[PDB]
Design a protein around this nucleic acid. Structure first.
Lengths: 104, 88, 66, 259, 70, 117
RNA sequence: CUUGAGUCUCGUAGAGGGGGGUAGAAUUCCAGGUGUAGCGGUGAAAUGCGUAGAGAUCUGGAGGAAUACCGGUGGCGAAGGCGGCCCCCUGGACGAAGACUGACGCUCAGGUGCGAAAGCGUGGGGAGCAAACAGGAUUAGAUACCCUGGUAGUCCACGCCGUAAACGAUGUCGACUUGGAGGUUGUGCCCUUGAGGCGUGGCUUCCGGAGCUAACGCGUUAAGUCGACCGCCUGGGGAGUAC
């Protein structure tokens, strides 16, 4: 429908919970016949500046071709979920399946 | 704007050839649909003045087209206005 | 002497942090298109990318802040 | 007729833009201005200093032929960029010749490293090379008789920015500038750079593959303020300069010359 | 303009470096600019005026240069 | 008083008056001095010399703490900026870092109106 | 009938508009730590804040407003105007080829809408700034300029107001007439042999030719050469006032 690109940052103490969260997110996307073109756990990462007093955080990239309702839902979930510190759902023109420059 | 598929559909229905697209009637239909679509938007967003300008322009264009149709060929115009449900 | 014209990139990536780092100051500021000689079209894109990065804590807003 | 059209495409065919075709005949000499005519719209105001060879006196009388250079047209009145750069292409060709047989042989004599590589001079010109290139091993030409005769065996060349470090003695043995701007960095790496334009606050020596250096007015000499850089150095000349400072961000490498 | 004195570096040199850094930053200038409120109009005017001046310097002067002084 | 080897010098350099404050690395102020305090008033205290002497005074004040290493944080625009740090150096601390810490907003609050003189 | 006008296809750049989120810097205040006599301010002072612990400095919190750098005689918009980042809704512009419609066009008195800032109404909000006001200076006086404070207001919602040097002091639309140097945004070909080479469109900054102009100047974005429609002027004041 519309090709979004999502990057969310999880609190580093909840790093072991991340995979489950990712799975959940994927599931929702799948539900509305939404494809998920790339998905990249960047892992624990040093922040350029300390958001909410903490210096590292766990970054997950995820590209999705989904309807906007589901995106909205995801956003809502993120906002209420306290594990995820920041998110940045961000539209894109194409599917962009090729890997990110920091993974490579 | 009007989605491509929708536009195509509109063209097919009103246009005689379906490849035509520029038929007066077809154009009018296209305009009308757009106007209808924008009504919903403008109910929500009453202060969106700039956008409303475009809508107004479109309406004017439609009116002009209708007028043109009327002088040329009355029956067709009548048919069109029955189809679309334009009071005038 | 623009890099992005020669590379022929379609869009500048906020994730490509290293690249960004060449166009950012020691103090964190985005470097002018006079100095870098970046093309105008690309420059804006680059700036946007940098901003995005800053939001994601990939790049810093400034050297001092903590 | 089409005689002229054909003559035009003929004359297009029998010239090219760079200093390649040795065509300008020296048609007036006066100190300090040489002048040629390579089939261009006007005659060059040549310096005398693009034409004296290795000890200071002139070498070419009337009728003699060197190509110059091009791609720059009309600053008001006149035609060229200097033929001496011409010469650089010839030097490049000889350096390239190495590739064929994997060994360019001339003479290279390198006494010392301004910036970590002995300086080698070939014919009139002198070039700077990275520190390893001067010696094959750890021999070091400091114990060799000063300004000794070998050749140059190439160690390293930078391929964009022109720095070539060459192999003295041991005959038996046989975007782009700004990401990795850490090569000439570390505090004081001396460079050989041609100055370009002196902007009454500066001199703008800039050689190392698409960068910009200043050497502004404060150093330049051992007088501060009364100096006026046009009096004190040159126009278009390869000099002693080193970095003293790099910002890889606001591309201002701030070189010096008082060293 | 964060700086660290290198091992066996003179004080004066360090100071100079710091100064240079500051200059590069344009921190002082920035401060000066934000001392008082500039009306938008005024800001616009300065920018355009400055631009005009620059243009004048570039072209008219160049034209003058073509002709010799004595 | 507990002696401390390393600390910070905060140099608040205004247009009218320089204030030097030596503190520990954590934030807790050890001593301070000012150009206004050093026996300079109006025209005099808005000068580099004044700033320097303030700095000197400050240094003197934190003698008992036994401070060898010192990082400097320079704030605001003023004469007392280079001079002050020089003075500090003279007074005989190993100057470790020289930081600028001027508060630059990213266009935030409206400044006061421009003076008509 | 297709050259004007419009429709369709694919892209393009954009501070165009409306709505909802969020980020970081800085100011202010609150609470607490450290610390000690000044701070602040000016031409110079004083009022003012300070030993009831200010200023400085560090930690934590609150809240509002605006978005450094990018940033440009850059961009978009009918004009007014529009500037962090993200999403949702949405208007226009331009190019590339085709395909279609077939004069459907231009202008417009009345009419209708949009229309900076200040201002008004009701309800919120209120950090900073600041008409009014107060004090301190300056001064012959100082109902000002400068300083210290400071309330409407600025901010948001929904209404009204309908004006500005609302300016390019230049109505809109179309056609035609030598050139140069740029900027920006497409697009066709070319060995992109390289940041290039040769074109071709849109918008745009400066200089200047003919011509025009009282001169200043304008000059393919005309103030030139013409056509279509509208608006407006008829000495200064009285007056854009009175009724």
């Amino acid at each position: 429908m519309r090709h979004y690109e999502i990057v969310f940052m999880v609190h580093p103490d909840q790093s072991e919970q991340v995979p489950g969260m990712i799975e959940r997110y994927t599931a929702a996307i799948t539900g509305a016949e939404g494809k998920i073109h790339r998905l990249e756990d960047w892992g624990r990462r040093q922040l350029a500046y300390p958001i909410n007093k903490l210096h590292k955080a766990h970054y997950v990239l995820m590209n999705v071709e989904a309807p906007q309702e589901v995106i909205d839902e995801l956003e809502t979930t993120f906002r209420f979920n306290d594990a995820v510190i920041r998110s940045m759902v961000m539209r894109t023109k194409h599917a962009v399946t090729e890997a990110s420059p920091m993974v490579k | 704007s009007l989605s491509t598929e929708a536009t195509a559909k509109i063209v097919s229905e009103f246009g005689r050839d379906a490849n035509d697209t520029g038929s007066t009637e077809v154009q009018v239909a296209l305009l009308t649909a757009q106007i209808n679509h924008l009504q919903g938007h403008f109910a929500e967003h009453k202060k969106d003045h700039h956008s409303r300008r475009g809508l107004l322009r479109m309406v004017s264009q439609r009116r002009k087209l209708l007028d043109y149709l009327k002088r040329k060929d009355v029956a067709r115009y009548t048919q069109l206005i029955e189809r679309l449900g334009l009071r005038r | 002497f623009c890099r992005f014209t020669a590379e022929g990139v379609q869009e500048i990536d906020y994730k490509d942090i290293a690249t960004l780092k060449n166009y950012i100051t020691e103090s964190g500021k985005i470097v002018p298109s006079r100095i870098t000689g970046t093309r105008a079209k690309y420059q804006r894109q680059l700036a946007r990318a940098i901003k995005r990065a800053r939001y994601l804590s990939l790049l810093p807003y400034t050297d001092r802040h903590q | 007729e089409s005689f002229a059209q054909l003559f035009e495409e003929s004359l297009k065919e029998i010239e090219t833009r760079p200093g390649s075709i040795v065509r300008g005949v020296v048609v007036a000499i006066d100190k300090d201005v040489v002048l040629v005519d390579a089939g261009l719209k006007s005659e060059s105001a040549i310096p005398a200093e693009q034409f004296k060879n290795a000890q200071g006196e002139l070498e070419i009388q009337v009728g003699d032929e060197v190509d110059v250079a091009l791609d720059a047209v009309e600053d008001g009145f006149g035609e060229t960029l200097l033929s001496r750069e011409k010469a650089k292409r010839h030097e490049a060709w000889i350096t390239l010749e190495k590739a064929y047989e994997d060994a360019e042989t001339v003479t290279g004599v390198i006494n010392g490293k301004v910036k970590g590589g002995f300086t080698v001079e070939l014919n009139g010109i002198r070039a700077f090379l990275p520190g390893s290139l001067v010696d094959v091993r750890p021999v070091r030409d400091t114990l060799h008789l000063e300004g000794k005769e070998l050749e140059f065996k190439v160690i390293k060349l930078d391929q964009k920015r022109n720095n070539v470090v060459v192999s003295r003695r041991a005959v038996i043995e046989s975007e782009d500038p700004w990401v990795a701007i850490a090569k000439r960095y570390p505090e004081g790496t001396k460079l050989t750079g041609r100055v370009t334009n002196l902007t009454d606050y500066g001199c703008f020596v800039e050689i190392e593959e698409g960068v910009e250096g200043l050497v502004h007015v404060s150093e330049m000499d051992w007088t501060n303020k009364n100096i006026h850089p046009s009096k004190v150095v040159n126009v278009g000349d390869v000099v002693e300069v080193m970095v003293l400072d790099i910002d890889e961000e606001r591309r201002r490498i701030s070189l010096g010359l008082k060293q | 303009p964060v700086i660290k004195v290198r091992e066996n570096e003179p004080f004066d040199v360090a100071l100079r470096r710091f100064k240079r850094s500051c200059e590069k930053a344009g921190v002082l200038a920035e401060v000066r600019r934000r001392e008082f409120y500039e009306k938008p109009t005024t800001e616009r005017k300065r920018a355009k005026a400055s631009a005009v001046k620059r243009h004048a310097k570039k072209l008219a002067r160049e034209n003058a240069r073509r002709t010799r002084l004595y | 008083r507990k002696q401390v080897s390393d600390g910070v010098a905060h140099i608040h350099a205004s247009f009218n008056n320089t204030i030097v404050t030596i503190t520990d690395r954590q934030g807790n102020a050890l001593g301070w001095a000012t150009a206004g305090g050093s026996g300079f008033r109006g025209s005099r205290k808005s000068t580099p010399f004044a700033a320097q002497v303030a700095a000197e005074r400050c240094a003197d004040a934190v003698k008992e703490y036994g401070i060898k290493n010192l990082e400097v944080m320079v704030k605001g625009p003023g004469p007392g900026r280079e001079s002050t740090i020089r003075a500090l150096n003279a007074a005989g601390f190993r100057i470790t870092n020289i930081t600028d810490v001027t508060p630059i907003p990213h266009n935030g609050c409206r400044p006061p109106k421009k003076r008509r003189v």
